[PDB]
């Protein structure tokens, strides 16, 4: 659909993001595992996000092939379903872990002594397990929506025409939009409270929290607006909406892989313990 | 009058410690070297043992 | 497990039970906050621990410990007794306490420089770099009487007092003479200057003006420890 | 240290009984407990095992589905609930301590036992009766179907002495180590399959029946018993 | 009268120095110059013992080279099975601030002490199945630095106050007191024959004591700062020390002198622990830097480095058979090191 | 063998001057921070002055500030204290104290009753 040079440039930027994200996630996992002192409560969530982003990036080349070439899907139906299941589960786990980090930071800042009394790692691992279970159970209706569509000469991994006709598409759209509406509210409110507490010096902590929330909204709002436009693109009367839904989803694709690349920088750059650990690796 | 008592005690200690027969440093170093050489084969850290004999591997 | 005899399995089970008990001990160890109380013989920290005892033994006893609770938070204060003058060796055991409580008798200016040197040594120590200090400038009424009498002068021992003027922004207690405020602010400024001369990022000093009748020292310790824990949480949670 | 057993008596061949073992004088919660029964005019027979924590429970094959073992650490009581009691369940049941760590001495203290009347490695002790006189040397031997030596280097062979009218008393644990309170005249040795117990100078106190037990695997099995008599 | 006594002491010190210089005909490094180098000593962490909540100050090996004991400021003593990493015992202490550990040569008792000026002995092998405190020795007026068992009924302690004492455990009384030092005695090493022992205090000197006579025999005074560690050569005719200055030094009993120094320009931290190899050719020292350096005793060279811990190394010990080295540190972890 | 010997001292008229010296041996003078302490009769030891390893950082007590000057000569292994305009309150025994450990900013027990790295002192009378 899109002109060839545009897809070449998008592929170059995507592979650069792939390199950056793979390096960042590997470094984060190695640093957390190697050092017992850096095995803090927040580092468990950071490691879970690193694993989720690593799986998302390991799934990237099939996505680039799927947009880039429209090559026939000779890989099978089961792989077509499993690939998108893994991707969706990883995205849900990422956003849930972001929300969990926001909540933990709020509780540890506004109520320090009570947080140190109550917060324990044994509950943290349980929270991580519940997060992953919720991801695997909210991304589980993707074995019905997604299937290989023919017309073996031409094949693509695409949402199923029966799912589209029956109406599962809009329900899944709203279920996914919940995963945007809740994390944005939690991040915004809790980080505003943290900044208000710290603002009563401390300028960079608040500015960094505002960059983090702005990056979250910047990267995740187009993803769900593009999904809404895609779901609405299937109406036979929707002619003008096709080009916008196309370039909206391509931009959401690029910001989707931008999120997995920028998450380690946003959450690991100000530690001053991560930095010395990395320089200790040498 | 505690300072003079302490000084007397220190003088007595120095007097006792001065009367000691001392051997040469060459002989003492030779003795240390000989002990090190005679027990070299019994040192697991100096000469590591095979993994079949190591209780920690 | 495989290639383990029955006695080996029972020994492993006993070790696991020991680890369980160790975790139960670890939770309680993490709950409480440990403080080290320091001062001189004229500081009056004995009255401070006596009034902490409101919040609820061999002759050669090396350490005295008192416990108290503020808002369901357990504090453990350790007072050093029956030890020699040399502190360079046994002070390293308190390099992981939450805070150091330094008590100073501000009434007499003869030993104020000794207290300042003690504060310098505590602040600049290699193993006490991380620890914050809660500074109590005790015996405020005696200092007020000494500065109202006019017999004793602070410029004799601190010549820069004559050039000192109290800051325009200040919060004097009602009914307090300007001379008392100037003396108190200069005395606190000495310690604050020492504190801010180096290592301000890692640890913070918390100066207070207390007395023998004052009964709010427990709340002050609670608030300062809350701020210390807040700073530690900011450091740990990748916020800074 | 004291273990006192309660329960036992005339029971029908279909009834249910509960045995209790009250412990005092030692840290009960940190010891594993065993039940051992001895049929009238017969040898010992292991029954059940509950660990220091209640995680691990073992049973003999003959009582696996009917018996159950439990402990009440605050009360320092050990129980054994028995159901579907048969005529071969008539024996005297003992309460045995056992603590396991590097260098411990399991099976050291036995209870006085309570009698009940109802209306696998093979350990071989060839000898049954031996005539002795005080001031002599005697040797008691036993054999094992399976090699008792382990990769650890331990052998896991135990020797007990049951004097007439008393409970068994541990003599040697893990085939060579002498138990505390046991005279130095007793010595233990043997290969990985055949073992021997030596008494240097006999006394009137040494007269009794001697049993050998293996602790390599469960169930724990005993020997027939070699009886020394004057 | 004081001036005359000071002059006499100065004259005696001068003549002692002259006598020591007369015997210094050759250096240790000159004699061992043609000896072959040890090479490179590579060691790996075989086991890592976890379970302590706070920093570890002391550890000790059993006479069977399998069992350990360690102390932390949580107020806990843990006895480990080094072969299988099993915790055999866990002993809660009455005072959190514990500075030292000792394991009885028989293996029936364990002692400890610290900021409380008391040495507490615990009975490991009781008929009740628990570890209980057997005796509290309460004569010292300063913090307890080191403990060393002589028998099941005799123990030698060094304390923050300048004295050292020998105790009778059954009666709980000081049999002998050693009163030579002028600073905190920080370490203590028993001789193989257990007829003598050495100590290092917060002055720059070390003293050789006679256990039975209860008096000082020699003083060595070679370092520049506080001595933190001391250990005996396996022969029993020499010993080594570690001090706040970066150097470690080897002293000689028979020649009454100092044999060689173990220092490097890149080392500007203090030595916390000192131990020897079974053959005596390797000297292992822990540092304020989070590493441990292996030294060649005969020729002052750094054969290898132990770089596992991520905090200050506080304790160090070598088994009686020379099989392994255990290293404790302020990050609350113990590591067992072995060769290849 | 750590040794510290003080040289200057004597009877001084009020408004006079003195110069104290402290020849040090048994340690590397360059790596240690040096102090001056005094003990007036009927009082405890008081810290007087202080100087770092290179002389960059110098500190005085308020009682003697503006009159006393401390300096060191790392090549000659000696420590100096120039006492100008002496007062009758300055009659004490002056000691030359050594910091316990090298490469450190903090000195702990220089004014302790029994300190190992301190001199025998010199008498100054005004
Ligand atoms: C051209 N556009 C209009 N078309 C036809 C598309 O299919 C797209 C463009 C695109 C083609 C190829 C490569 C990259 C982007 C636009 C839409 C997105 N999308 C997807 O595949 C979805 C399917 C889906 C899963 N849960 C839902 C819930 C509600 C609606 C939809 C879905 N999955 C994913 O986004 C990930 C990366 C998580 N696996 C692809």
The C-alpha torsion from E90 through E94 and E97 to E98, rounded to 10°, is -50
Query: Which residue is it, tokens 């002498």?
Result: D178
Name the residue at shortest CA distance from atom 37 of ligand 1.
A87
Query: Does the beta carbon of F116 lie under 8 angstroms from any beta carbon of chain E?
Result: yes
Mutational pocket test of ligand 1: of A2, A14, A66, A88, the residue with most ligand atoms within 8 Å of the beta carbon = A88
Widest pairwise Cα distance in chain F:
40
**Does residue E100 contact residue E58 with C-beta atoms inside 8 Å?**
yes
Distance from CA of C12 to the nearest CA of D (A): 8
For residue A181, what are the contacts with CB-CB under 8 A and spacing of at least 6?
A: none
Is the backbone peptide bond immediately before D21 cis, with ω within 30 degrees of 0?
no
**Does residue D33 contact residue D9 with C-beta atoms inside 8 Å?**
no
Q: Tokens standing for C107? A: 């009434």
**Does residue A264 contact residue A24 with C-beta atoms inside 8 Å?**
yes
- Neighbour tally for D3: CB within 10 Å: 24
CB contact under 8 A, D102 and E67: yes
**Does residue F32 contact residue C125 with C-beta atoms inside 8 Å?**
no
The shortest CB-CB distance from D27 to any of E66, E89, E130 is to E130
Output the DSSP codes for D6-47. E---EE-TT--EEEEEEEESS-GGGSEEEEEEE-TTS-EEEE
Nearest to residue B20, comparing CAs of E194, E253, E180? Answer: E253
Query: Least CA distance to D32: which residue of chain E?
Result: E129
Name the residue at shortest CA distance from atom 31 of ligand 1.
A227
Confirm or reject: Cβ of A63 under 6 Å from ligand 1.
Answer: yes
Strand partners of residue D228: D130, D208
Cα distance between residue A25 and residue A19, in whole Å: 10
Distance from CA of F111 to the nearest CA of E (A): 14
The shortest CB-CB distance from B3 to any of E2, E83, E298 is to E2
**Does residue A19 contact residue A60 with C-beta atoms inside 8 Å?**
no
CA of E310 to the centre of ligand 1 (A): 48
Chains in contact with E via at least 3 Cβ–Cβ pairs below 8 Å: A, B, C, D, F
Numbers of helices and strands, H then E, in chain E:
2, 28
Interhelix angle A4-34/A41-58, rounded to 10 degrees, is 150
Confirm or reject: Cβ of A172 under 6 Å from ligand 1.
Answer: yes
**Does residue D46 contact residue D121 with C-beta atoms inside 8 Å?**
no
Output the DSSP codes for F4-44. EEE---EE--TT-EEEEEEEEESS-GGGS-EEEEEE-TTS-
Interface test with E, best of B18, B41, B46 (most E CBs within 10 A): B46
- Residue C199: Cβ-neighbour burial (10 angstroms; 0-12, 13-18, 19+): middle
What CA–CA distances, in Å, run from E190 to E110, E148, E300?
16, 7, 25
CA torsion sign for A223, A226, A232, A234 is: negative
Query: Least CA distance to C155: which residue of chain F?
Result: F62
**Does residue E159 contact residue E143 with C-beta atoms inside 8 Å?**
yes
**Does residue E101 contact residue E72 with C-beta atoms inside 8 Å?**
no
Cα distance between residue E241 and residue E162, in whole Å: 18
Q: What sections of chain A are H helices per DSSP?
A: 4-34, 41-58, 60-68, 77-110, 112-118, 121-138, 142-145, 161-166, 168-199, 203-232, 241-268, 274-281
- Neighbour tally for A171: CB within 10 Å: 14
CA of A231 to the centre of ligand 1 (A): 10
Confirm or reject: Cβ of A92 under 6 Å from ligand 1.
Answer: no
CA of A83 to the centre of ligand 1 (A): 12
Confirm or reject: Cβ of A231 under 6 Å from ligand 1.
Answer: yes
CA of A146 to the centre of ligand 1 (A): 10
Distance from CA of C89 to the nearest CA of E (A): 8
Query: Does the beta carbon of F114 lie under 8 angstroms from any beta carbon of chain E?
Result: yes
- Which atom from ligand 1 is nearest to the alpha carbon of A139? 26
Q: Tokens standing for E36? A: 């072959």
CB contact under 8 A, C86 and E183: yes
DSSP letter for C54, please.
Answer: G
Resolution of the experimental structure, in angstroms: 2.9
Output the DSSP codes for A175-224. HHHHHHHHHHHHHHHHHHHHHHHHH---HHHHHHHHHHHHHHHHHHHHHH
What residues in chain E have their Cβ under 8 A from chain A's Cβ atoms? Answer: 310, 331, 333
Query: Which residue is it, tokens 């009255």?
Result: C47
- Which atom from ligand 1 is nearest to the alpha carbon of A63? 13
Cα distance between residue D15 and residue D27, in whole Å: 34
Chains in contact with A via at least 3 Cβ–Cβ pairs below 8 Å: C, E
Query: Does the beta carbon of A279 lie under 8 angstroms from any beta carbon of chain E?
Result: no
Cα distance between residue C204 and residue E8, in whole Å: 53
**Does residue E274 contact residue E231 with C-beta atoms inside 8 Å?**
yes
CB contact under 8 A, C11 and E81: yes
**Does residue E116 contact residue C61 with C-beta atoms inside 8 Å?**
yes
Q: Tokens standing for E180? A: 């030579």
What residue ranges do the domains of chain D occupy? 2-118, 123-227
The class that CATH gives domain D123-227 is mainly beta
- Which atom from ligand 1 is nearest to the alpha carbon of A84? 39
Cα distance between residue E112 and residue E118, in whole Å: 8
The shortest CB-CB distance from A112 to any of C233, C238, C239 is to C233
CA of A84 to the centre of ligand 1 (A): 9
Which residues of chain A does E331 touch, with a Cβ-Cβ cutoff of 8 Å?
A: 36-37
Q: Phi and psi dihedrals of C9, rounded to 5? A: -65, -40
The strand pair at F10-11 and F122-125 is best described as parallel
CB contact under 8 A, B25 and E6: no
Query: Which residue is it, tokens 């105790």?
Result: E167
Mutational pocket test of ligand 1: of A11, A55, A84, the residue with most ligand atoms within 8 Å of the beta carbon = A84
What CA–CA distances, in Å, run from F5 to F22, F97, F121, F124?
5, 10, 7, 15
For residue A266, what are the contacts with CB-CB under 8 A and spacing of at least 6?
A: A211, A212, A215
Cα C21 to its chain centre, rounded Å, is: 32
**Does residue C92 contact residue C129 with C-beta atoms inside 8 Å?**
no
CB contact under 8 A, C239 and A40: no
Measured at the CA of C123, the angle between CA C121 and CA C127, to 5 degrees, comes to 90
Name the residue at shortest CA distance from atom 16 of ligand 1.
A249
Cα E117 to its chain centre, rounded Å, is: 19
CA of A29 to the centre of ligand 1 (A): 29
CA of A135 to the centre of ligand 1 (A): 18
Q: Phi and psi dihedrals of E93, rounded to 5? A: -100, 155
CB contact under 8 A, B29 and E31: yes
Q: Phi and psi dihedrals of D147, rounded to 5? A: -65, 130
Cα distance between residue D107 and residue E4, in whole Å: 74
Cα distance between residue C145 and residue C151, in whole Å: 10
**Does residue C208 contact residue C136 with C-beta atoms inside 8 Å?**
yes
Cα distance between residue E164 and residue D30, in whole Å: 39
CATH topology classification for B3-57: G Protein Gi Gamma 2 (4.10.260)
The class that CATH gives domain D2-118 is mainly beta
Cα distance between residue A95 and residue E248, in whole Å: 56
């Amino acid at each position: 659909l899109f002109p060839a040079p545009l897809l070449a440039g998008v592929t170059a930027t995507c592979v650069a993001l792939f390199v950056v994200g793979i390096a960042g996630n590997l470094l984060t996992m190695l640093v957390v595992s190697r050092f017992r002192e850096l095995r803090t409560t927040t580092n468990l969530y950071l490691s879970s996000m690193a694993f989720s982003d690593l799986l998302i990036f390991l799934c990237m080349p099939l996505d680039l092939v799927r947009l880039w070439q429209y090559r026939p899907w000779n890989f099978g139906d089961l792989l077509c379903k499993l690939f998108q299941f893994v991707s969706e589960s990883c995205t849900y786990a990422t956003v849930l872990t972001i929300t969990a980090l926001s909540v933990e930071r709020y509780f540890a800042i506004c109520f320090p002594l009570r947080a140190k009394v109550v917060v324990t790692k044994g509950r943290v691992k349980l929270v991580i397990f519940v997060i992953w279970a919720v991801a695997f159970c909210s991304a589980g209706p993707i074995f019905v929506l997604v299937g290989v569509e023919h017309e073996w000469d031409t094949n693509e991994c695409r949402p199923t025409e029966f799912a589209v006709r029956s109406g599962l598409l809009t329900v899944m759209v709203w279920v996914s939009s919940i995963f945007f509406f809740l994390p944005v509210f939690c991040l915004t409110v809790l980080y505003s409270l943290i900044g208000r507490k710290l603002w009563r010096n401390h300028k960079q902590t608040v500015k960094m929290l505002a960059v983090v929330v702005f990056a979250f909204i910047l990267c995740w709002l187009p993803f769900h607006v593009g999904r809404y436009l895609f779901s609405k693109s299937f109406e036979p009367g929707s002619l003008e909406i096709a080009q916008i839904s196309q370039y909206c989803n391509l931009v959401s694709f690029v910001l989707f892989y931008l999120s997995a690349a920028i998450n380690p920088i946003l959450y690991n750059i100000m530690s001053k313990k991560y930095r010395v650990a990395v320089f200790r690796l040498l | 009058t505690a300072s003079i008592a302490q000084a007397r005690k220190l003088v007595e200690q120095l007097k006792m410690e001065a009367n000691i027969d001392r051997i040469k440093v060459s002989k003492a170093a030779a003795d240390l070297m000989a002990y090190c050489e005679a027990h070299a084969k019994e040192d697991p850290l100096l000469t590591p043992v095979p993994a079949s004999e190591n209780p920690f591997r | 497990g495989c290639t383990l005899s029955a006695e080996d399995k029972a020994a492993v089970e006993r070790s696991k039970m020991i680890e369980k008990q160790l975790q139960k001990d670890k939770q309680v160890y993490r709950r409480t906050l440990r403080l080290l109380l320091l001062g001189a013989d004229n500081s009056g920290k004995s009255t401070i621990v006596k009034q902490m005892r409101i919040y609820h033994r061999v002759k050669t006893s090396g350490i005295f410990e008192t416990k108290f609770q503020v808002d369901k938070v357990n504090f453990h204060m350790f007072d050093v007794g029956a030890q020699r003058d040399e502190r360079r060796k046994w002070i390293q055991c308190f390099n992981d306490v939450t805070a150091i409580i330094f008590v100073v008798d501000s009434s007499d200016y003869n030993r104020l420089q000794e207290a300042l040197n003690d504060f310098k040594s505590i602040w600049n120590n290699r193993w006490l770099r991380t620890i914050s200090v809660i500074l109590f400038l005790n015996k405020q009424d005696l200092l007020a009487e000494k500065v109202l009498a006019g017999k004793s002068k602070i410029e004799d021992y601190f010549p820069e007092f004559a050039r000192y003027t109290t800051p325009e922004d200040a919060t004097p207690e009602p009914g307090e003479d300007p001379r008392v405020t100037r003396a108190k602010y200069f005395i606190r400024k000495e310690f604050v200057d020492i504190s801010t001369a180096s290592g301000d990022g890692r640890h913070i000093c918390y100066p207070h003006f207390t007395c023998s009748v004052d009964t709010e020292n427990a709340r002050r310790i609670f608030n300062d420890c809350k701020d210390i824990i807040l700073q530690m949480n900011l450091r740990e949670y990748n916020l800074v | 240290v004291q273990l006192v057993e309660s329960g036992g008596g005339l029971v029908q061949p279909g009834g249910s009984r509960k045995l209790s073992c009250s412990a005092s004088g030692f840290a009960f919660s940190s010891f594993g407990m065993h039940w051992v029964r001895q049929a009238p005019e017969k040898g010992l027979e292991w029954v059940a095992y509950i660990s220091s924590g209640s995680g691990t429970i073992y049973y003999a094959d003959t009582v696996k589905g009917r018996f159950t073992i439990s402990r009440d650490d605050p009360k320092n009581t050990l129980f054994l609930q028995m159901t579907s009691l048969r005529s071969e369940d008539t024996a005297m049941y003992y309460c045995v301590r056992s603590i396991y760590y590097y260098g411990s001495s399991p099976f050291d203290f036995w209870g006085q036992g309570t009698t009940l009347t109802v209306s696998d490695i093979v350990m071989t002790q060839a000898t049954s009766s031996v005539p002795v006189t005080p001031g002599e040397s005697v040797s008691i031997s036993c054999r094992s179907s399976k090699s008792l030596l382990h990769s650890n280097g331990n052998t896991y062979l135990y020797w007990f002495l049951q004097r007439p009218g008393q409970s068994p008393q541990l003599l040697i644990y893990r085939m060579s180590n002498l138990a505390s309170g046991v005279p130095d005249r007793f010595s233990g040795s043997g290969s990985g399959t055949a073992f021997t117990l030596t008494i240097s100078r006999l006394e009137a106190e040494d007269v009794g029946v001697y049993y050998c037990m293996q602790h390599l695997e469960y169930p724990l099995t005993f020997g027939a018993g070699t009886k020394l008599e004057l | 009268e004081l001036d005359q006594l000071r002059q006499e002491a100065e004259q005696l010190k001068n003549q002692i120095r002259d006598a020591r210089k007369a015997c210094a005909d050759a250096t240790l490094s000159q004699i061992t110059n043609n000896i072959d180098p040890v090479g490179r000593i590579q060691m790996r962490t075989r086991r890592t013992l976890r379970g302590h909540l706070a920093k570890i100050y002391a550890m000790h090996w059993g006479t069977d080279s399998r069992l350990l004991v360690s102390a932390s400021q949580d107020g806990k003593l843990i006895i480990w099975d080094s072969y299988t990493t099993n915790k055999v015992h866990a002993i809660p202490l009455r005072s959190s601030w514990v500075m030292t550990c000792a394991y009885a040569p028989s293996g029936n008792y364990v002692a400890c002490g610290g900021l409380d000026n008391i040495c507490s002995i615990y009975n490991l092998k009781t008929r009740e199945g628990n570890v209980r405190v057997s005796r509290e020795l309460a004569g010292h007026t300063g913090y307890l630095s080191c403990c060393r068992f002589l028998d099941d009924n005799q123990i030698v302690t060094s304390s923050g106050d300048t004295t050292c004492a020998l105790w009778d455990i059954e009666t709980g009384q000081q049999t002998t007191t050693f009163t030579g030092h002028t600073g905190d005695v920080m370490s203590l090493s028993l001789a193989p024959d257990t007829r003598l022992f050495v100590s290092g205090a917060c002055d720059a000197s070390a003293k050789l004591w006679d256990v039975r006579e209860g008096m000082c025999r020699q003083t060595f005074t070679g370092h520049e700062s506080d001595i933190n560690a001391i250990c005996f050569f396996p022969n029993g005719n020499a010993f080594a020390t570690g001090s706040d200055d970066a150097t470690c030094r080897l002293f000689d009993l028979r020649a009454d002198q100092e044999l060689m120094t173990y220092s490097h320009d890149n080392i500007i931290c203090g030595i916390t622990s000192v131990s020897f190899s079974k053959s005596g050719r390797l000297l292992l020292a822990g540092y304020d830097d989070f590493n441990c350096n292996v030294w060649d005793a005969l020729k002052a060279d750094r054969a290898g480095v132990l770089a596992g811990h991520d905090n200050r190394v506080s304790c160090l010990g070598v088994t009686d058979d020379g099989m392994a080295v255990a290293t404790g540190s302020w990050d609350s972890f113990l590591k067992i090191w072995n060769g290849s | 063998q750590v040794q510290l010997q003080e040289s200057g001292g004597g009877l001084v008229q009020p408004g006079g001057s003195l110069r104290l010296s402290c020849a040090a041996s048994g340690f590397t003078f360059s790596n240690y921070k040096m102090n001056w302490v005094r003990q007036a009769p009927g009082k405890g030891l008081e810290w007087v002055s202080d100087i770092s390893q290179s002389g960059a950082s110098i500190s005085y007590t308020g009682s003697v500030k503006g009159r006393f000057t401390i300096s060191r000569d790392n090549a000659k292994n000696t420590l100096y204290l120039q006492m100008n305009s002496l007062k009758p309150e300055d009659t004490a025994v002056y000691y030359c104290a050594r910091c316990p450990a090298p490469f450190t900013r903090d000195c702990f027990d220089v004014t302790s009753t029994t300190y190992a790295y301190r001199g025998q002192g010199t008498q100054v009378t005004v």
